[PDB]
Amino acid sequence: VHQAISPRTLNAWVKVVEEKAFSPEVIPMFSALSEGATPQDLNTMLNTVGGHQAAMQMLKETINEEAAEWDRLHPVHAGPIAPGQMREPRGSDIAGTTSTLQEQIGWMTHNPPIPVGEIYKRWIILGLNKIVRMYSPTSILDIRQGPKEPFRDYVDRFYKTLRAEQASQEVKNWMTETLLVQNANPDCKTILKALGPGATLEEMMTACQGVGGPGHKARVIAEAMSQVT
Amino acid sequence: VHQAISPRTLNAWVKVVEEKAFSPEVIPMFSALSEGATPQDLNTMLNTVGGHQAAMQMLKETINEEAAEWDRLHPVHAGPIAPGQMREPRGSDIAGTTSTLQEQIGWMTHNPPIPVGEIYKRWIILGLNKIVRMYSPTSILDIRQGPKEPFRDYVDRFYKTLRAEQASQEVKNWMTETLLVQNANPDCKTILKALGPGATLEEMMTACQGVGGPGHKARVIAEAMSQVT
Amino acid sequence: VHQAISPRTLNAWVKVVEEKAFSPEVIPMFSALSEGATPQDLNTMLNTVGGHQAAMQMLKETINEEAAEWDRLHPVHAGPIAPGQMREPRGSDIAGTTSTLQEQIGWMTHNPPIPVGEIYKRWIILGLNKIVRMYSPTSILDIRQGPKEPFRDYVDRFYKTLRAEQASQEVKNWMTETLLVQNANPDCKTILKALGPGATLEEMMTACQGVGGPGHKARVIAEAMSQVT
Amino acid sequence: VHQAISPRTLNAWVKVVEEKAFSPEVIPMFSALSEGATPQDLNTMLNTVGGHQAAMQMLKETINEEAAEWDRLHPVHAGPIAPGQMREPRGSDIAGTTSTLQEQIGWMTHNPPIPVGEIYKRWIILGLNKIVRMYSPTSILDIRQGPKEPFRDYVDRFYKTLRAEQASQEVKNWMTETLLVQNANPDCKTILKALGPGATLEEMMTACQGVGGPGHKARVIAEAMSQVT
Amino acid sequence: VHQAISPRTLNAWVKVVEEKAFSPEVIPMFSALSEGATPQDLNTMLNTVGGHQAAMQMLKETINEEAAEWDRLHPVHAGPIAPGQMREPRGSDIAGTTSTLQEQIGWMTHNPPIPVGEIYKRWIILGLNKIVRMYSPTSILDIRQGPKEPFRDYVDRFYKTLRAEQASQEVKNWMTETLLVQNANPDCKTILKALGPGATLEEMMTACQGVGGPGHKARVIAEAMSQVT
Ligand SMILES: CC(C)(C#Cc1ccc(-c2ccc(Cl)c3c(NS(C)(=O)=O)nn(CC(F)(F)F)c23)c([C@H](Cc2cc(F)cc(F)c2)NC(=O)Cn2nc(C(F)(F)F)c3c2C(F)(F)[C@@H]2C[C@H]32)n1)S(C)(=O)=O
Ligand SMILES: CC(C)(C#Cc1ccc(-c2ccc(Cl)c3c(NS(C)(=O)=O)nn(CC(F)(F)F)c23)c([C@H](Cc2cc(F)cc(F)c2)NC(=O)Cn2nc(C(F)(F)F)c3c2C(F)(F)[C@@H]2C[C@H]32)n1)S(C)(=O)=O
Ligand SMILES: CC(C)(C#Cc1ccc(-c2ccc(Cl)c3c(NS(C)(=O)=O)nn(CC(F)(F)F)c23)c([C@H](Cc2cc(F)cc(F)c2)NC(=O)Cn2nc(C(F)(F)F)c3c2C(F)(F)[C@@H]2C[C@H]32)n1)S(C)(=O)=O
Ligand SMILES: CC(C)(C#Cc1ccc(-c2ccc(Cl)c3c(NS(C)(=O)=O)nn(CC(F)(F)F)c23)c([C@H](Cc2cc(F)cc(F)c2)NC(=O)Cn2nc(C(F)(F)F)c3c2C(F)(F)[C@@H]2C[C@H]32)n1)S(C)(=O)=O
Ligand SMILES: CC(C)(C#Cc1ccc(-c2ccc(Cl)c3c(NS(C)(=O)=O)nn(CC(F)(F)F)c23)c([C@H](Cc2cc(F)cc(F)c2)NC(=O)Cn2nc(C(F)(F)F)c3c2C(F)(F)[C@@H]2C[C@H]32)n1)S(C)(=O)=O
Ligand SMILES: O=P(O)(O)O[C@H]1[C@H](OP(=O)(O)O)[C@@H](OP(=O)(O)O)[C@H](OP(=O)(O)O)[C@@H](OP(=O)(O)O)[C@H]1OP(=O)(O)O
């Protein structure tokens, strides 16, 4: 079509997703970048969202709901071939799963036009609005050790979140060497600080392996009593 | 139709839901606002309920049960076209899922009349009665930290509830400023007050990160023994 | 039918359920009140049981098994119209789900008679016997705080049970004023008594919010040591 | 008629208004949710705005201004219209006040099309932009007692604003419990604090009834003079 | 005709208005008592409301708005009606201002029926809801003297409110003897108490005629300064 997305349009959409994630600003930008686009172009835009797999699953659920709504309003015709005309779209055709680009173009350019692109755009906008309201991406900054969480479990959660984090490898290494010790609970922080700089992750995990164990509990209790007595 | 809901009727229903939520007063108001309305108007009223999604799901379940009951009382005919007459309504037709507005008007104005609007209204009333009896909306005022609940889990619950709360953003900010520290458990509240005013949420979470850990338990036990000795 | 339930019969059944709940005395009364009644009348009696939803679900399950047994023993005929006679009942027809009142009267008054009312009555009697043996209604008197249960969870259980309780509103308020503090665990009961009369529920929950937390445990341990030393 | 508002679209619009009020975010959401909608659908969306009646009146004034502009640009055509042709829309027809849904659909689905829905959407967007720039909703947090304002007048303003506030009834009770005394002027606030907790609204009003009168002025002047010497 | 309001129905509505004023209970009650009634019966019910003329004016405004909306939905035809046919009702006809009882009956008893009574009752319900939400009746208990308000002006406000108050003459006299001095401002209250019991309204007004004047203010400053000396 005339309004097929240009290379700069697609790149702008990619950069919007990468920089803003799913802040409200994503909704206008998508609306502005995808106007006149076929459902195939919209699917191309959706497929370039790296990460946020849970958010994209949420979006797909919303699209399926809206497709079911469309199918409820549009009943399947009683098998009239109508060789002059073409088949009426279904919800899956609007979402582009069961329709080709030629069919979408034909629906968009027919008289009267069926703007399958704009209908799909509204479905996607509903999904994006739901994501913006509900979804919260994981953040490495939010990973803190629980007061009773073993240090190894905390480290596992930290590294899982770090793997999912959007950052360069150097930045992730820097995050490892600051946040991991920073966001440990006080009991493990004391041990890790006493361990000193240059301690490896294995040394750190060995040093905190007994926190919450009977011996460590006895030790800290006895130290507290000695201080207050 | 003559009794189609007016703009003021729809706005009054919206304001009723926003002001009273699902107090018993909702039941008369709905009854008064929806009399003579087609099932399409009733669905329009139901779609304007913002929030209370669990209550609306309960209402939908009740509507489905009543539609099944109607289907049990009304057997589908043995395919008599009856071109002079029209097809008999099903339960989904009364709820408006499988019927159009024209069909609803045709049933409502036929002689003898099938008041699909009134039947659907009674089903909705049953759902509303169930909601009024059972459903309790979440309240930010009810979020209190458990005696052994970690402060971060409490903060997550608080912010989830605040997100679901019906309030302006300034009011939500004021709620964060007061209720969060107010409704923490005594162990965390002692630390939070020791921090003083002006502490951020991150400083507050770091300060309470050790509550329940071995070191904090030893410290408070030692302080108690020193006081009693 | 000649033995259709009278207004006084239905009201007597309602009063029997309200006063006796599902004590064994319910089984004779039902038997006495429902003799000669159609399945329609029996369903009317079953629908007037307010509350005891779990017991009624048990009764429905028993009725379904008995209907399945009837269907096992009665095979569907090989489609003989038999215009002189009527269709043979199925289990669902005896339970009244798939049968109209006219069909039930026709079966009951046919020669030889098929006493669908009496068969359905025996199914209901089996269900009632099962309820009498197994089902135990929830009681506000039985709601007591566990030794380690947080006060807020106990209060939530108490208020849920109170909502399900069969009592006047004034009686429920009196129960709240007596049983809630009466049935708290000793640790919370001490604090609640120290509050004194006139404390609100919010002040009660605040006062017990720390029971089970480290500070409260340190306090009580130190107090016990001081008393024994 | 393919782009009619779905139940989820209308609910999303309602939630947008309830959550964001008239922050700038409302403008993209509206434009995203109303694409291809008829003027009737747009009016339905506008009627679901609960509260903000003054803002809605500003929007209606903007719409009337734009309709007047349209009428100035499009002069009426004297003489009967052609039987095949339809009447040209006026501003009121675009706004949906004097046009039925069928007429709007006919205008939109025509060769060449008159996009009455999109023109009306632009008018509504102008109104929303004016609201976002100028309208400021009343907030209970901004009700402060003036230095010379009688306490009763301040209480009246507080309760009017609280009635207008978008909040649950429990939240409104909490706001009364906190802000009313918190936001009184110092002269009334010292007396209100001297009253002590648990004071009723009538006791608070009678306690502050004399602030500003000759006796209170004489008393405070004498006390200040005694403090000085 | 069949559902015309009985004498007991009218009396029950009168008692409802007198006992509850415009509490929310007025809405279901009016809904129940007015079912099937003609616009003439509804107008009689509305005319039997004694007092609350501001609320009744609000109701009339709402009715006029709803009549205008109905007129917008129902364009005036050329009216070449057959002798058997009858003129289509307008908003004023539904409200009963321009329609006789016979015309309302004819619209209500017609094929297809035009339920003018029920449409009118919905308009009245919208007005009643507006009243319940917004209107607040004047209460003699709320009349308090302002801190700088002249005593004579307070007396005039009190007597105006007392004249408007719904109460027996003996209760009004008791109100005058109880609340007038009670709800005066502290300076006037001090003088009135010094005046002792048995003083008439003229002595009470003369005793407080100088409060806030130069002599009284100078006197109170002198007494306060002497007290703190
Ligand atoms: C060839 C081409 C032109 C095309 C096309 C093309 C065609 C159709 C669809 C599609 C559209 C709508 C539905 Cl409603 C379904 C469906 N409904 S269903 C039966 O329930 O699953 N299935 N499809 C797959 C279908 F149709 F092919 F079968 C779809 C896609 C979607 C676009 C899309 C991505 C998205 F994230 C969320 C959406 F809502 C829609 N892309 C996928 O679906 C693959 N995907 N899915 C998910 C997830 F599940 F996490 F959301 C994820 C992907 C991912 F991209 F890898 C990314 C990590 C996230 N693209 S091109 C140049 O773009 O390559
Ligand atoms: C075009 C128009 C005239 C129309 C129509 C229209 C037509 C039908 C229905 C509908 C009615 C009855 C059933 Cl019994 C089902 C059904 N039964 S089923 C197979 O089990 O799901 N499905 N539907 C969807 C159907 F029919 F379209 F398929 C329905 C709706 C409902 C109205 C409704 C809302 C509601 F809250 C609870 C109800 F009981 C009924 N609205 C929805 O359902 C969408 N919804 N649902 C839910 C939830 F699930 F949480 F309750 C929520 C929504 C929501 F509004 F977003 C809101 C957050 C809550 N509206 S208009 C101007 O209004 O846009
Ligand atoms: C019109 C009329 C003459 C009639 C009839 C009428 C007709 C049939 C049935 C019925 C009978 C037997 C089965 Cl075996 C099923 C079935 N089997 S199934 C597919 O598995 O669910 N469904 N039905 C619904 C059917 F038939 F309509 F489809 C039935 C009922 C039952 C009577 C009944 C009540 C009961 F408590 C326990 C029973 F075993 C049977 N009433 C309901 O069922 C509705 N109910 N259910 C339950 C629960 F689930 F908790 F037990 C509850 C209700 C409740 F009453 F609200 C109450 C809170 C409890 N009444 S009248 C004057 O009485 O109104
Ligand atoms: C039946 C249906 C399909 C329809 C329709 C329908 C049809 C037309 C109109 C309408 C549109 C444009 C103009 Cl320009 C005027 C007009 N211009 S005029 C002569 O100067 O007053 N009048 N109308 C009434 C008309 F047409 F009947 F005459 C309109 C509405 C508006 C939509 C609207 C709402 C709004 F808030 C602000 C707007 F700008 C437009 N809704 C109302 O107007 C009622 N309203 N008004 C106001 C206020 F004044 F405060 F802004 C308020 C309401 C309220 F919603 F109650 C809410 C508290 C606020 N809806 S449905 C399912 O939606 O019910
Ligand atoms: C024969 C008979 C059966 C009849 C009839 C009869 C016929 C019509 C109307 C009427 C109805 C609707 C509108 Cl919309 C207007 C209108 N619209 S308009 C152009 O703007 O003024 N005018 N009317 C007068 C009309 F029609 F004559 F023109 C009406 C009334 C109203 C009923 C009514 C009372 C009410 F309180 C509020 C309402 F909304 C409607 N009663 C009056 O109006 C007189 N009234 N009004 C007001 C007020 F203004 F405060 F609200 C007050 C009165 C009052 F009762 F004195 C009382 C102190 C309050 N009754 S009966 C019983 O008499 O024997
Ligand atoms: O408070 P309690 O309900 O009495 O539970 C405590 C305690 O839990 P707390 O954190 O709440 O104080 C211990 O937990 P830790 O502090 O050591 O993490 C736990 O000890 P363990 O988890 O190491 O087993 C101990 O269990 P126990 O006494 O059996 O060793 C258990 O006490 P009780 O089971 O006796 O209640």
Ligand SMILES: O=P(O)(O)O[C@H]1[C@H](OP(=O)(O)O)[C@@H](OP(=O)(O)O)[C@H](OP(=O)(O)O)[C@@H](OP(=O)(O)O)[C@H]1OP(=O)(O)O
């Ligand atoms: O008490 P306020 O309401 O705050 O105003 C007072 C004062 O009031 P009172 O006499 O009741 O104490 C005078 O008002 P009136 O005498 O007319 O009643 C006024 O005018 P005068 O100088 O003539 O006394 C005076 O002065 P000004 O308004 O110029 O400030 C002003 O004093 P303050 O504002 O400083 O309190």
